[PDB]
Design a protein around this motif. Structure first.
Motif, PDB file in Angstrom:
ATOM      1  N   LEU A  25       0.099  11.602  -4.117  1.00  0.00           N
ATOM      2  CA  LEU A  25      -0.325  10.105  -3.768  1.00  0.00           C
ATOM      3  C   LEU A  25      -1.664   9.501  -3.923  1.00  0.00           C
ATOM      4  CD1 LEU A  25       1.228  10.928  -0.325  1.00  0.00           C
ATOM      5  CD2 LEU A  25       2.606  10.250  -2.308  1.00  0.00           C
ATOM      6  N   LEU A  40      -6.832   3.483  -1.406  1.00  0.00           N
ATOM      7  CA  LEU A  40      -7.274   2.142  -1.913  1.00  0.00           C
ATOM      8  C   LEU A  40      -8.565   2.006  -1.549  1.00  0.00           C
ATOM      9  CD1 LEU A  40      -7.505  -1.249  -0.823  1.00  0.00           C
ATOM     10  CD2 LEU A  40      -6.785  -0.500  -3.203  1.00  0.00           C
ATOM     11  N   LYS A  47      -1.330   8.750  -7.696  1.00  0.00           N
ATOM     12  CA  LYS A  47      -0.641   7.285  -7.595  1.00  0.00           C
ATOM     13  C   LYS A  47      -1.324   6.073  -7.001  1.00  0.00           C
ATOM     14  CE  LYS A  47       4.018   9.384  -7.161  1.00  0.00           C
ATOM     15  NZ  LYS A  47       4.832  10.550  -6.422  1.00  0.00           N
ATOM     16  N   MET A  48      -1.666   6.039  -5.937  1.00  0.00           N
ATOM     17  CA  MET A  48      -2.495   4.629  -5.491  1.00  0.00           C
ATOM     18  C   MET A  48      -3.625   4.228  -6.339  1.00  0.00           C
ATOM     19  SD  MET A  48      -2.333   2.582  -2.903  1.00  0.00           S
ATOM     20  CE  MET A  48      -3.370   1.100  -3.686  1.00  0.00           C
ATOM     21  N   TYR A  94       2.500   1.555  -3.491  1.00  0.00           N
ATOM     22  CA  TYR A  94       1.540   1.813  -4.350  1.00  0.00           C
ATOM     23  C   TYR A  94       1.230   3.346  -4.151  1.00  0.00           C
ATOM     24  CZ  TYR A  94      -0.895  -2.806  -5.590  1.00  0.00           C
ATOM     25  OH  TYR A  94      -1.077  -4.184  -6.098  1.00  0.00           O
ATOM     26  N   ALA A  95       1.215   3.818  -2.860  1.00  0.00           N
ATOM     27  CA  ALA A  95       1.130   5.224  -2.731  1.00  0.00           C
ATOM     28  C   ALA A  95       2.300   6.279  -3.071  1.00  0.00           C
ATOM     29  CB  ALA A  95       0.708   5.411  -1.281  1.00  0.00           C
ATOM     30  N   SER A  96       3.486   5.591  -3.115  1.00  0.00           N
ATOM     31  CA  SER A  96       4.825   5.992  -3.773  1.00  0.00           C
ATOM     32  C   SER A  96       4.861   5.904  -5.188  1.00  0.00           C
ATOM     33  CB  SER A  96       5.854   5.268  -3.040  1.00  0.00           C
ATOM     34  OG  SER A  96       5.821   5.615  -1.651  1.00  0.00           O
ATOM     35  N   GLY A  97       3.963   5.193  -6.064  1.00  0.00           N
ATOM     36  CA  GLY A  97       3.724   5.156  -7.342  1.00  0.00           C
ATOM     37  C   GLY A  97       4.289   4.072  -7.965  1.00  0.00           C
ATOM     38  N   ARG A  98       4.385   2.975  -7.404  1.00  0.00           N
ATOM     39  CA  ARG A  98       5.132   1.752  -7.900  1.00  0.00           C
ATOM     40  C   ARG A  98       4.437   0.511  -7.706  1.00  0.00           C
ATOM     41  NH1 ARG A  98       8.375   6.725  -7.024  1.00  0.00           N
ATOM     42  NH2 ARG A  98      10.138   6.164  -7.962  1.00  0.00           N
ATOM     43  N   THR A  99       4.257  -0.486  -8.508  1.00  0.00           N
ATOM     44  CA  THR A  99       3.693  -1.830  -8.061  1.00  0.00           C
ATOM     45  C   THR A  99       4.798  -2.829  -8.098  1.00  0.00           C
ATOM     46  OG1 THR A  99       3.539  -2.422 -10.813  1.00  0.00           O
ATOM     47  CG2 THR A  99       1.757  -1.355  -9.842  1.00  0.00           C
ATOM     48  N   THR A 100       6.221  -2.597  -8.593  1.00  0.00           N
ATOM     49  CA  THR A 100       7.203  -3.514  -8.375  1.00  0.00           C
ATOM     50  C   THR A 100       8.352  -2.590  -7.655  1.00  0.00           C
ATOM     51  OG1 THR A 100       6.808  -4.869 -10.244  1.00  0.00           O
ATOM     52  CG2 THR A 100       9.223  -4.503  -9.905  1.00  0.00           C
ATOM     53  N   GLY A 101       9.198  -3.111  -6.565  1.00  0.00           N
ATOM     54  CA  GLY A 101      10.305  -2.153  -5.873  1.00  0.00           C
ATOM     55  C   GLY A 101      10.582  -2.927  -4.640  1.00  0.00           C
ATOM     56  N   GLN A 111       7.640   0.732 -15.638  1.00  0.00           N
ATOM     57  CA  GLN A 111       7.213   1.632 -14.692  1.00  0.00           C
ATOM     58  C   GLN A 111       8.393   2.683 -14.529  1.00  0.00           C
ATOM     59  OE1 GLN A 111       6.212  -0.377 -10.559  1.00  0.00           O
ATOM     60  NE2 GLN A 111       8.287   0.588 -10.218  1.00  0.00           N
ATOM     61  N   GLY A 154      -2.165   4.964   2.078  1.00  0.00           N
ATOM     62  CA  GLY A 154      -2.280   4.065   0.841  1.00  0.00           C
ATOM     63  C   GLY A 154      -3.475   3.120   0.915  1.00  0.00           C
ATOM     64  N   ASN A 185      14.099   1.445  -7.872  1.00  0.00           N
ATOM     65  CA  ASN A 185      12.963   1.787  -7.043  1.00  0.00           C
ATOM     66  C   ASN A 185      13.005   1.175  -5.510  1.00  0.00           C
ATOM     67  OD1 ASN A 185      10.769   3.351  -8.743  1.00  0.00           O
ATOM     68  ND2 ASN A 185      11.193   1.622 -10.039  1.00  0.00           N
ATOM     69  N   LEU A 237       0.698  -1.218  -0.058  1.00  0.00           N
ATOM     70  CA  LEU A 237       0.068   0.035   0.105  1.00  0.00           C
ATOM     71  C   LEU A 237       0.681   1.193   0.049  1.00  0.00           C
ATOM     72  CD1 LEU A 237      -2.677  -1.293   2.561  1.00  0.00           C
ATOM     73  CD2 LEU A 237      -3.084  -0.676   0.132  1.00  0.00           C
ATOM     74  N   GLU A 260       4.927  -6.643  -8.646  1.00  0.00           N
ATOM     75  CA  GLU A 260       3.556  -6.613  -9.087  1.00  0.00           C
ATOM     76  C   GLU A 260       2.620  -6.707  -7.990  1.00  0.00           C
ATOM     77  OE1 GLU A 260       3.660  -5.970 -13.530  1.00  0.00           O
ATOM     78  OE2 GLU A 260       4.186  -4.698 -11.873  1.00  0.00           O
ATOM     79  N   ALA A 262       4.273   7.663 -13.383  1.00  0.00           N
ATOM     80  CA  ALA A 262       3.759   8.049 -12.039  1.00  0.00           C
ATOM     81  C   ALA A 262       5.034   9.092 -11.579  1.00  0.00           C
ATOM     82  CB  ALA A 262       3.330   6.931 -11.165  1.00  0.00           C
ATOM     83  N   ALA A 274      -1.875   2.966  -9.613  1.00  0.00           N
ATOM     84  CA  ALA A 274      -1.050   1.760  -9.435  1.00  0.00           C
ATOM     85  C   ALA A 274      -2.030   0.681  -9.182  1.00  0.00           C
ATOM     86  CB  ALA A 274      -0.334   1.921  -8.073  1.00  0.00           C
TER      87      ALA A 274
END
Lengths: 375, 166, 375, 375, 166
Positions: free
Chosen positions: E111, D346, E114-115, D143-150, E136, D342, D296, D140, D167, E105, E118
């Protein structure tokens, strides 16, 4: 009192060096095949009186200590610390001079020609022995298990090997590697103890967990039955004192740990299990010789020592290979040392010496002598 | 002058004779020394060898009920010493032999003996190449029986030591 | 060498200074590290030849001054009044010149580098000393008790320390101080005697209350059992005989005084007691070492002198330590000056001039020399 | 409006518990993971009401409480104080009824999946909730930092968590805990202030040591480079104002405190700092995804809020890893509520029925339905 | 209640026209999109396409260096988006024309853009098919030229990207 003496025997296994003399009916030294050097002393411990440590000694003596296995993935890639392991074997653990004693070394399966020749160099150049040889582990365990043709599974600490053998000669191409071993089952034991909420992160906790593993783990015959019997048990859970007197408790983890050696799927590893790699080694051999490989599966190595493992191997092979051949496992009660026991008894016989490399043949014709001795 | 005594090299002659095997034909049965002790020389400069009741080979069967017993029943009652012991022991999976380095200090001994031997703990040990196990022994209650010497050597890994079963 | 000057040993301690010559195994100068600065201005006709009266001369005044330690918190929190303490040591109490003799000076544990550097500065520049050496109080106490590994409790005048040690090295991640000490036991003794209606208010009666502590206190073996007995019979009390006054008779307060060490609640602290802080020190030391510290708890410092305290320590630590751990406490006969006596012994060994910080090494290496020259 | 049911959102990680409603960018309850259960008897006992002292109450009613931290090292085992701190969040801080409200809760890193069933169990069979859902706080925050992978990190005041993600899924074998964060950092803070003779020793004075820790501290860009800059700085030393109007100065402690997250060496751990923990995590992942993990690395969390920490994390990983790797350490200007917000963002879009476990679906299935719904 | 967002097939109608080839001598040149952006609604229940500029293969004659190095000069630095690129790389071994999916992003983007983008990112990634690669990307400096785009396709086949030799 030269060639009439008792020969020195060292099994140079992947995470336990097992050594002694030919006619010691059990080993005289046992220690980890690991070397390290301390970092960061003066800041949390006194500066080391030994600026390098080997074995159990390297896990014991404190600091931010960096360890290596020089046989890192079952082949001897580093010699610098492996020559320290041999120096440590003779002068620190067995407490003999190697210049007194004819020396039998073993090798782990697949050992390169240049590694065999460098292993011939070291005994005459670094340790000045009168005579030696380098024998493959599997044949000694096979011959002590009473076969000359068969298949050995060895599961060591730093590698697992599946080795088809025909009258003492192993077939290299059909040998299957498994990179998951005893050290890595101990990494999964640390994980499932973290699920039970324990800290277990340090080398000091990890080698207590490595002791707990060999003292308390077993393989389940039917895991779902075992886990149903775990949820209704009165005997599975075992308490254990840490050496400062703090008490911990381990239960279901005792069979969750080694299950990953048969079923890598249990940790999400897309790899085949020890029964499948044994089957895949047999099934690559010619039709007319496969029959008595199924009847002659030897268990060697340190990680084959858990209760229920041979009985699970019987179950897992009959759930995979046809039943028209007669399936048989031979799994001695001291199996981790059976290789070295076969070494000890073989290396007591002076009755034919053509296979033993002399210092004379080295000073004539170098380490390349090691290939002519296999006959 | 404000530091500890030097190690005299004749302890290294003794250590590298004690610690090793020999040929078993005769030399193991005729040259080994199972316990050996060292003392501060009253020059106050060095650690040396002393009139100390060692045992060899036959002396264990011909008289003294174990070799380690011969040393730890005959320790100087009011002065500190440095000693070596050649421990020969049975674990749950193997035979083993390990080299014990021993600081003996009876707790009633002179404070200046204690300081001299304590400040030479560093100095003597760098010469004793391949020492495995260090004992700081503080009184005869830190010896006790022979099972307590197995605990002070290697804990519950040992099950017999010197022919006394633990 | 041995035909030259009898080296001086000064223990700065924790509020009480002890000094004498090395190899005389009892101190000969001994004074409180209290400095009495005036609370108002002095007259210029009949003026004194020092700004402030120290120690013996501080206590041998009345009303005109405020009494302060320079080392109040277990580290030197004023240096000018500590420079005065060393000036008063040499020329008022030890009664020798500084630039005559070699000096060994004790350091407190958990000091910053600059403390060792400024203490080396003082002796070479402010006092012209030829040869200087520095040692940790606990190591002196531990080596005089014939240990190289163990845990020293040093319960002082102004601070109590627990210092765990392994191969002579003190483990910095596990040293613990407690601000409660011999000062506050005497101050609490004065207040619990004010509950009994005794006069005890003056700086003269405060030293008589020091004497009532020394000549009459003990630790109770079990406080509530001792309290039940001492509330039901006077066959436990005793007089302190004043020469001008009368028989000041101390009951329950004989043991309620040092009970403060096991129960800081009596001082009004929510903090852990001596046995808790010793256990918390041990259990923060590395898992191996915990075995060796339980079997080697050495007592040092003045506030460990009371009868029943070692007896009580073995009782109240086996209510914390696992029943499989083999606990052994060491209280020396008198243990009050164990620190300084270990210094006296160490500064009169017939071996090594090369550990003295000489003024000719300070010429090259400056104040940092001390960090090359220590064990 | 009064329809389109806005759910409750709660985060629990390693320190501050954070709770509010969905779509709302602020929590409405924020307090530390702390429950005080007595050493034996409490203080001000009479008619019992909720006699475990929680949050605000626990630090304000010191000494007699054995303080427990329900969610600390990540895996909850202290589950009954977890019951009580959730009860405190709902009925003492927020002061709403879970009986009305669909509750979104976070899973903290490393938890075994039966711990999802235990919160599903408690939320229905204790708090009587209409529905529940759970997601991982780290994912979360990523995702709030703008990534799905990292690879996201949260250093709180229990431990530091480090979680590599592809992901939305955390890679099991490469998730890592480091048992050092704000609490033990704030202990070391008091030890390096002890070097200057300050002692602050009550729980009431431990409020000052956090106030210093949160406000004045930063990571040094390099340790001895910062020491050389401090030695010429007109603004490094800050005269600090205490609650009771007293004054001290906090100085060179400001950076040498935070230095501990890279230097566990000052804590007596063999386990390496945050930098090597992030690298050893990425080194236990497949080749074709390590690119995205280095590129990331996201610094989220509570004690990770310091200046210099991302800047310093670049330096020590570019010295550790082969210099042809590309590494981006990202840190947003606030990073502390990323985990919770996040979850709020969400949740923010209203009407859903798939991944929520409702009461009427639990009645025919029990808690095990959670594994069919919560990723 | 954690509803998420949904892709309407208006995003897929432009994807289909972009994805697939047609007549080479005109309709590959000016009936193929080479770039497009996809955007969350103000309502926030759906992903849409808007006026966020599409450019073709031939527009290199009419205006630009290439369409995607024009597109990175038009990306919103303070909002998160999805993009789509048909990336042309050329060599003697292969003439690779790969369709790439892009999650944009920025570090500077908020934020609560973003969320949302994402959590719906891999719903749209399952609606598209005949994408080969994915990015990404988290700021202008991760996308600022073709040579930084070619690294994220990888291999050694990208000797040139978008008519520019690397």
């Amino acid at each position: 009192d030269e060639d009439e003496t008792t020969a020195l025997v060292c099994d140079n296994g992947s995470g336990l060096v097992k050594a002694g003399f030919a006619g010691d009916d059990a080993p005289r030294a046992v220690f980890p095949s690991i070397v390290g050097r301390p970092r960061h002393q003066g800041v949390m411990v006194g500066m080391g009186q030994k600026d390098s440590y080997v074995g159990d000694e390297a896990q014991s003596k404190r600091g931010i200590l960096t360890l290596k296995y020089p046989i890192e993935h079952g082949i001897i890639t580093n010699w610098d610390d492996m020559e320290k392991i041999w120096h440590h074997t003779f002068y620190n653990e067995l407490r003999v001079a190697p210049e007194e004693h004819p020396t039998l070394l073993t090798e782990a399966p697949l050992n390169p020609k240049a590694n065999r020749e460098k292993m011939t160099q070291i005994m005459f150049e670094t340790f000045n022995v009168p005579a030696m040889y380098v024998a493959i582990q599997a044949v000694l365990s096979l011959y002590a298990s009473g076969r000359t043709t068969g298949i050995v599974l060895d599961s060591g600490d730093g590698v697992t090997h599946n080795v088809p053998i025909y009258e003492g000669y192993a077939l290299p191409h059909a040998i299957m590697r498994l990179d998951l071993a005893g050290r890595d089952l101990t990494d999964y034991l640390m994980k499932i103890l973290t699920e039970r909420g324990y800290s277990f992160v340090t080398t000091a906790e990890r080698e207590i967990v490595r002791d707990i593993k060999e003292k308390l783990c077993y393989v389940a015959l039917d895991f779902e039955n075992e886990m149903a019997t775990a949820a209704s048990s009165s005997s599975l859970e075992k308490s254990y004192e840490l050496p400062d007197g703090q008490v911990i408790t381990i239960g279901n983890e005792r069979f969750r740990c080694p299950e990953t050696l048969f079923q890598p799927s249990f940790i999400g590893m897309e790899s085949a299990g020890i029964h499948e790699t044994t089957y895949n080694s047999i099934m690559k051999c010619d039709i007319d010789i496969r029959k008595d490989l199924y009847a002659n599966n030897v268990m060697s190595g340190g990680t084959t020592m858990y209760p229920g493992i041979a009985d699970r191997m019987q179950k897992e092979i009959t759930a995979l290979a046809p039943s028209t051949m007669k399936i048989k496992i031979i799994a001695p009660p001291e199996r981790k040392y059976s290789v070295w026991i076969g070494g000890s008894i073989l290396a007591s016989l002076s009755t034919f010496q053509q296979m033993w490399i002399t210092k004379q043949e080295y000073d004539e014709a170098g380490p390349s002598i090691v290939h002519r001795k296999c006959f | 002058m404000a530091s500890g005594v030097t190690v005299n090299d004749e302890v290294i002659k003794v250590f590298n004779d004690m610690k090793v095997r020999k040929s078993s034909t005769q030399e193991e049965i005729k040259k080994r020394k199972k316990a050996v002790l060292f003392c501060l020389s009253d020059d106050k400069r060095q650690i040396i060898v002393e009139e100390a009741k060692q045992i060899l080979v036959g002396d264990i069967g011909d008289t003294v009920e174990d070799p380690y017993t011969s040393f730890v029943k005959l320790l100087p009652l009011n002065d500190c010493r440095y000693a070596l012991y050649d421990a020969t022991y049975e674990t749950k999976e193997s035979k083993k032999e390990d080299l014990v380095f021993i600081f003996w200090a009876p707790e009633s001994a002179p404070l200046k003996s204690k300081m001299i031997y304590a400040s030479s703990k560093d100095a003597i040990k760098k010469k004793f190449t391949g020492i495995k196990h260090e004992w700081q022994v503080n009184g005869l209650d830190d010896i006790k029986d022979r099972s307590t010497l197995g605990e002070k050597l290697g804990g519950n890994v040992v099950v017999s030591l010197e022919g006394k079963p633990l």
